[PDB]
């Protein structure tokens, strides 16, 4: 019970109201394995998409709940969204958290899943920290309740207890769709324009491999891959269900930090959620020969289709078999600014 | 009630206070839970000074400074080179 | 080992320089030797305002020396090693105290310019001794002149919020070990400038550092017990300002706290051992 | 009294390195008490560890320094540092610093790069890097710069939209000198002991922010509303909101005295924290032959 009194006194600048949370250790195992993170608040809207200011959230792991029903970490969700009077709530409304120790993993959370659980729960001098004074006397079991989490079908534990007028005005709040809809269809729009760029690049060229990366290939490659077997290039667009782990937007945010590359890897036909957004280096003295070795090891991955994005406005597709199809990247800077504001600061 | 204590150290003078704070931290974690200073004093918690140096080639040999009432062991410092410095608070 | 340094006078003197040096035969004096670059006469010169912090840095820069004897042409004095001991008498314009006092300061004379300054008309060196005065006396005096300059400049700024009588009853009087002494009066203007810009940048610096170091340790008992301490209104505004000017303010904050940190150390810290009251001399050694 | 402490090697020093150890004569090296390892700074600053410049600061401050004057094969002579003797030190370090200031001298870890202070020793399994010698104002400025860099590079890494990583590495960046700017060596992680130093510093900071003399606030408000001083350039004619909101009270004098009392004591404690690392008082650094008589303060 430390991070709640940490962030409660901290975020008084950009947030009127602060909600406190638990996060179980099973619910973020598919987010980041091996306990690699240890945050940043940016709650986007449902139909009032735009852009909003960011707020920092502090947290801790490895410290156990008073409930022995599950044993996990500490988080907390700021709420600052409602204009003027905070009595209205935005329904069907995402609130993004960027839990991190060094920006890996995201945390999408709802206002219904938060507040329905919240209602379900309920010669001079030094001045004292005022808000910590009421948490020590509570120490009770009814303050924490189990909430069916909507993004991942699991339990997310909230903590709240009858503090004061900020949390007292919270439990009376109600009000009279499209917050998970917009980001996915926006990903499919940029994926369709990139696949259209690949279509027109294969059309204006002879529909032929230039083979930018060198591999040796067997003579039965037109047999063990069938004729025109682009069924993986076909269902590429459904397979990109993630984007901000995907390397495609990673090059656009990398414009603020010249010879850099990011690589997505998707398997040959559904071997699993392989990886998204790995790094090809040119800065350290491993050098361009090490970049070439990693690149040809990328190209010899005979069961994974790779997509290459550059920083300068160019896209590339790597067929397994060393074949490369060139492509453009040129997107409207409104979506660019929307992406870099969705992650961080312009 | 206050207390005077003594510290042997083989390290230098200026770096010794920061390790003394690390040692001394459980004594300061008990303060401020039960008291809060008004009339503002009391934020200082002890002060250290240098008494001098001695030779580490011959270590301190414990002897017996005895009163007639009971026994009382004592740390003997031989070849001490006395140098009183100034008070340094923590 | 002979640590005696003769200063060759250029011009012959007469009896007033004899009477003033034998009036001042106990007190100490800086060094570089030459007759011109001898005392604080290069920093108490009237061609500029005699500043404080440069005077302090020049005094800590060169070594210190005690005067022993004055002739018509020679000025016999002895400098200071941190190896061996020496003698020291007061012979000062204030006759304050040597109350067995285990620590001693050497401050530049802030009571009066000419109070220490033996002015000689035959040679325009206008030699001037630093004030020797014990350490809590020195800290109380520097406090009570720094706040005196802040209060004088704020009553010159606006005569509504400050007065002079209730601070003359309060900070014009120094008191220590049953002795009650009195002191009243642009070098302290520069000192209070440094002090005010330090305490002005101190909230931003402190709140930035505690937001940096606040949750490195994930559960420390000391960390919580020191972060419940500060003011609840001293912790609002960081991210409104940029990175560059903030870090420049951090840089000037750090160099100014370092300079004032050595300055609130009491300079060349002399140490006394046994003060004989019937003789007015003390046994001293540099520390 | 003795100063001559001979240190034997264990194997034949090769003749390629006797030339550069002839070149590094009169430099400073940190001691261990003999043996061969640790007589130098390689054991706590290696290539493996990110150079924190604080644990090696702990080792150089905690151990008595030593002058290296004579190197032979299989034997080299050292001389300790004991207070009361005025050692002759030659400024023989490739980032040059003239001692025109003739001030107090300071020793620091090799923050000006590994190559400038290292020497390879293929005789035994020991490598030697050297402590840096540099004047007091540059040393304390580089000290506060490396602490401010290891506290702010981490929070710039904490930024998700870290659009400017190179902002502090070029604004903080090099070192302040009138002769030239000399770029230093920068760690990325501060290490444990560096965060311990920032921990104690932030402890002093949050203790001292509880007491501010309220008259000084009025002075800086009045001077902002006077002409903007050249020292006031960092404000660029702006009153911060925080000093505007901590002046809701009036000007007193009773709390001012005890405020200033605890401020003197805590600034002397902060000075005792920042007078860390062994210090040299200089008498008459001779310019024409680059040697300085200095004794331990």
Q: Which value, to the nearest 10 degrees, does the dihedral of the CA atoms of residues A64, A66, A68, A72 take?
A: -30
Rounded to 5 degrees, φ, ψ at D221 are: -65, -40
Closest residue in chain B to residue D199, using alpha carbons only? B18
**What is the sign, positive or negative, of the torsion defined by CA atoms of A47, A50, A53, A59?**
positive
Inter-chain contact B17–D272, Cβ cutoff 8 Å?
yes
Task: Give C104's strand partners.
Answer: C134, C270
Nearest Cα to Cα of residue C222 among B49, D154, A100, B90 = B90
* Cα–Cα distance measured from residue A18 to residue A138, given in angstroms and rounded to the nearest whole number: 18
Nearest Cα to Cα of residue D208 among B78, C210, A298 = C210
Q: How far is B36 from chain C (nearest CA, A)?
A: 10
Structure tokens at C108: 């530049």
Mutate to test the interface with D, among C209, C228, C234, C248 (most CBs of D within 10 A): C209
Structure tokens at A26: 């099973």
Task: Give C181's strand partners.
Answer: C174
Please tell me which of the candidates A6, A38, A126 has its beta carbon nearest to residue C229.
A126
Residues of B in contact with C269 (CB under 8 A): 86
Structure tokens at A293: 């070795």
| Whether the Cβ atoms of residue A304 and residue A268 lie closer than 8 Å to each other | yes
Name the C residues in 202-241 with CB < 8 Å from any D CB: 202-207, 209-210, 212-213, 216-217, 222-223, 226-227, 229-231, 233-234, 236-237
Please tell me which of the candidates D195, D213, D232 has its beta carbon nearest to residue C216.
D195
Contacts of D291 (CB under 8 A, 6+ apart): D26, D88, D89, D90, D285
Q: How far is A102 from chain C (nearest CA, A)?
A: 12
Structure tokens at D295: 């004794």
Residues of B in contact with A127 (CB under 8 A): none
Tell me chain D's radius of gyration from C-alpha atoms. Answer: 23
Contacting subunits of D (3+ beta carbon pairs below 8 A): A, B, C
Closest residue in chain A to residue D165, using alpha carbons only? A257
Contacts of C229 (CB under 8 A, 6+ apart): A126, D206, D207, D210
- Give burial (CB, 10 Å; 0-12/13-18/19+) of D54: buried
DSSP-derived secondary structure letter, A132: G
Contacts of A234 (CB under 8 A, 6+ apart): none
Contacts of C203 (CB under 8 A, 6+ apart): C234, D209, D212, D242, D243, D246
* Cα–Cα distance measured from residue B2 to residue B49, given in angstroms and rounded to the nearest whole number: 17
For tokens 């610093």, name the residue.
D97
Strands C64-70 and C179-182: what pairing? unpaired
* Cα–Cα distance measured from residue A256 to residue A346, given in angstroms and rounded to the nearest whole number: 9
Cα–Cα distances (Å) from C263 to A258, C6, C54, C259, D219, in that order, read 50, 31, 11, 6, 21
**What is the sign, positive or negative, of the torsion defined by CA atoms of A233, A239, A242, A245?**
negative
Closest residue in chain C to residue D260, using alpha carbons only? C143
Strands B61-64 and B73-76: what pairing? antiparallel
* Cα–Cα distance measured from residue C114 to residue C128, given in angstroms and rounded to the nearest whole number: 8
Cβ count within 10 A of residue C1: 5
Contacts of D79 (CB under 8 A, 6+ apart): D3, D4, D5, D66, D67, D69, D87
Nearest Cα to Cα of residue D109 among D30, D35, D24 = D30
DSSP-derived secondary structure letter, A49: -
E strands, A105-143, in order: 107-110
Q: How many CA atoms lie within 13 A of C89 on its CB side?
A: 12
* Cα–Cα distance measured from residue A190 to residue A246, given in angstroms and rounded to the nearest whole number: 13
Count of residues in chain A: 346
* Cα–Cα distance measured from residue C215 to residue A60, given in angstroms and rounded to the nearest whole number: 9
Q: How far is C269 from chain B (nearest CA, A)?
A: 9
For tokens 């390195």, name the residue.
D17
Q: How far is B2 from chain C (nearest CA, A)?
A: 21
The SS3 of residue B28 is helix
* Cα–Cα distance measured from residue A68 to residue A22, given in angstroms and rounded to the nearest whole number: 13
Task: Give A267's strand partners.
Answer: A304
Residues of D in contact with B13 (CB under 8 A): none
Q: How many CA atoms lie within 13 A of A296 on its CB side?
A: 9
Structure tokens at A94: 């995402």
E strands, chain B, in order: 47-48, 52-54, 61-64, 73-76, 80-82, 88-89
Closest residue in chain B to residue A125, using alpha carbons only? B38
Q: In what order do the strands lie in the sheet with D279-286?
A: D86-90, D291-296, D279-286, D105-108, D132-135
Rounded to 5 degrees, φ, ψ at D222 are: -70, -35
* Cα–Cα distance measured from residue A223 to residue A205, given in angstroms and rounded to the nearest whole number: 25
Cβ count within 10 A of residue A280: 17
How was it solved? cryo-EM
Task: Give D292's strand partners.
Answer: D89
Task: Give C175's strand partners.
Answer: C180
* Cα–Cα distance measured from residue C283 to residue C104, given in angstroms and rounded to the nearest whole number: 12
| Whether the Cβ atoms of residue C127 and residue C38 lie closer than 8 Å to each other | yes
Cα–Cα distances (Å) from A335 to A24, A276, A338, B84, in that order, read 34, 20, 5, 70
Q: How far is C127 from chain A (nearest CA, A)?
A: 43
Strands A17-23 and A155-159: what pairing? antiparallel
Cβ count within 10 A of residue A76: 25
| Whether the Cβ atoms of residue A13 and residue A56 lie closer than 8 Å to each other | no
* Cα–Cα distance measured from residue A330 to residue A315, given in angstroms and rounded to the nearest whole number: 9
- Give burial (CB, 10 Å; 0-12/13-18/19+) of A291: middle
Inter-chain contact A100–D259, Cβ cutoff 8 Å?
no
* Cα–Cα distance measured from residue A308 to residue A286, given in angstroms and rounded to the nearest whole number: 20
For tokens 């090490």, name the residue.
A290
Across chain D, which distance is largest between two alpha carbons, in Å? Answer: 76
Element (H, E) at B90: none
Rounded to 5 degrees, φ, ψ at A216 are: -90, 140
| Whether the Cβ atoms of residue C123 and residue C10 lie closer than 8 Å to each other | yes
Tell me chain C's radius of gyration from C-alpha atoms. Answer: 23
Inter-chain contact B83–C287, Cβ cutoff 8 Å?
yes
E strands, C58-129, in order: 64-70, 74-79, 85-88, 104-107
Nearest Cα to Cα of residue A28 among A95, A94, A102, A104 = A104
* Cα–Cα distance measured from residue A271 to residue A301, given in angstroms and rounded to the nearest whole number: 13
Q: How far is C271 from chain B (nearest CA, A)?
A: 9
Helix axes of C187-212 and D192-208: crossing angle, nearest 10 degrees: 120
Q: How far is D207 from chain A (nearest CA, A)?
A: 10
Contacts of A226 (CB under 8 A, 6+ apart): none
Cβ count within 10 A of residue C132: 27
Question: What DSSP assignment string belongs to A280-295?
Answer: E--SSTTHHHHHHHHH
For tokens 């230039």, name the residue.
A210
| Whether the Cβ atoms of residue C56 and residue C47 lie closer than 8 Å to each other | no
Q: Is B74 an interface residue toward D (CB < 8 Å)?
A: no
Inter-chain contact C287–B85, Cβ cutoff 8 Å?
yes
* Cα–Cα distance measured from residue A40 to residue D160, given in angstroms and rounded to the nearest whole number: 8
Inter-chain contact D161–A98, Cβ cutoff 8 Å?
no
Structure tokens at D226: 């006077």
The SS3 of residue A185 is helix
Cα–Cα distances (Å) from B10 to B54, B56, B57, D63, D272, in that order, read 10, 8, 11, 9, 18
Please tell me which of the candidates D152, D243, D270 has its beta carbon nearest to residue C261.
D270
| Whether the Cβ atoms of residue D62 and residue B12 lie closer than 8 Å to each other | yes
Breaks in chain A, after residue numbers (C to N greater than 2.5 Å): 38, 102, 122, 176, 257
* Cα–Cα distance measured from residue D237 to residue D239, given in angstroms and rounded to the nearest whole number: 7
Count of residues in chain B: 90
């Amino acid at each position: 019970m430390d991070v709640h009194i940490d962030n409660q006194v901290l975020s008084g600048l950009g947030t009127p109201l602060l909600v406190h949370l638990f996060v179980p250790d099973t619910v973020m195992a598919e987010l980041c394995p091996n306990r690699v993170p240890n945050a940043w608040c940016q709650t986007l809207f449902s139909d009032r998409t735009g852009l909003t200011r960011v707020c920092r959230v502090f947290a801790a792991r490895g410290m156990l709940p008073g409930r022995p029903s599950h044993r996990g970490t500490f988080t907390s969700v700021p709420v600052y969204c409602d204009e003027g009077l905070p009595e209205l709530y935005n329904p069907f409304h995402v609130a993004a958290l960027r839990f991190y120790d060094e920006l890996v993993g995201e945390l999408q959370i709802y206002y219904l899943s938060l507040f329905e659980g919240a209602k379900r729960a309920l010669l001079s001098r030094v001045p004292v920290s005022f808000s910590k004074t009421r948490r020590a006397i509570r120490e009770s079991r009814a303050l924490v309740r189990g909430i069916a989490h909507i993004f991942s079908p699991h339990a997310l534990y909230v903590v709240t207890y009858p503090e004061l007028s900020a949390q007292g005005r919270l439990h009376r709040m109600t009000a009279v769709l499209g917050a998970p809809e917009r980001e996915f269809r926006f990903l499919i729009s940029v994926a369709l324009r990139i696949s259209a760029s690949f279509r027109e690049k294969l059309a204006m060229q002879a529909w032929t491999a230039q083979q930018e990366i060198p591999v040796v290939i067997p003579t039965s490659y037109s047999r063990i891959y069938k004729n025109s077997d682009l069924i993986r290039e076909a269902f590429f667009t459904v397979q990109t269900r993630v984007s901000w782990e995907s390397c495609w937007v990673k090059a656009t945010i990398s414009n603020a930090p010249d010879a850099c590359l990011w690589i997505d890897s998707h398997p040959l036909y559904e071997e699993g959620a392989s990886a998204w957004g790995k790094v090809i280096d040119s800065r350290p003295p491993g050098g361009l020969v090490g970049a070439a070795s990693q690149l040809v090891a990328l190209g010899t991955d005979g069961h994974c289709v790779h997509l290459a994005t550059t920083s300068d406005g160019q896209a590339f597709l790597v067929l397994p078999g060393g074949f490369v199809i060139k492509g453009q990247l040129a997107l409207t800077p409104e979506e660019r600014g929307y992406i870099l504001a969705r992650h961080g600061i312009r | 009630g206050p207390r005077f204590t003594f510290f042997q150290s083989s390290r230098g003078h200026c770096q010794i206070m920061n390790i003394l704070r690390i040692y001394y931290s459980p004594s300061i974690m008990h303060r401020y839970a039960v008291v809060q200073p008004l009339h503002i004093e009391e934020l200082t918690f002890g002060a250290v000074a240098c008494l001098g140096t001695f030779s580490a080639t011959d270590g301190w040999r414990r002897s017996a400074f005895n009163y007639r009432g009971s026994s009382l062991p004592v740390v003997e410092i031989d070849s001490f080179y006395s140098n009183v410095s100034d008070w340094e608070v923590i | 080992m002979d640590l005696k340094v003769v200063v060759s006078l250029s011009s012959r003197l007469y009896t007033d320089e004899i009477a003033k040096m034998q009036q001042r035969i106990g007190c100490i004096l800086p060094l570089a030797q030459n007759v011109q670059g001898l005392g604080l006469g290069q920093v108490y010169s009237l061609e500029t305002v005699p500043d404080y912090v440069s005077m302090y840095n020049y005094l800590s820069d060169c070594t210190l020396a005690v005067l022993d004897e004055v002739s018509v042409d020679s000025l016999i004095l002895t400098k200071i090693v941190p190896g061996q001991t020496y003698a020291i008498k007061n012979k000062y314009q204030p006759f304050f105290q040597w109350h067995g006092t285990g620590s001693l300061s050497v401050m530049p004379p802030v009571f009066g310019r000419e109070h220490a300054t033996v002015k000689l008309e035959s040679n325009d060196v206008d030699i001037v001794f630093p004030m020797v005065l014990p350490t809590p006396i020195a800290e109380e005096v520097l406090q009570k002149i720094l706040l005196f300059n802040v209060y004088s400049r704020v009553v010159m700024q606006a005569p509504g919020n400050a007065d002079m009588l209730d601070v003359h009853m309060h900070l014009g009087s120094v008191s220590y070990l049953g002795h009650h002494y009195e002191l009243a009066l642009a070098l302290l203007d520069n000192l209070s400038l440094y002090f005010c810009i330090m305490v002005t940048l101190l909230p931003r610096a402190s709140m930035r550092l505690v937001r940096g170091l606040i949750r490195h340790e994930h559960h420390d008992l000391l960390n919580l017990f020191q972060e419940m301490v500060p003011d609840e209104i001293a912790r609002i505004d960081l991210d409104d300002l940029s990175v560059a000017d903030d870090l420049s303010r951090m840089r000037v904050m750090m160099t100014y706290l370092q300079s004032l940190a050595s300055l609130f150390n009491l300079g060349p810290r002399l140490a006394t051992a046994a003060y004989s009251q019937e003789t007015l001399t003390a046994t001293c050694w540099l520390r």
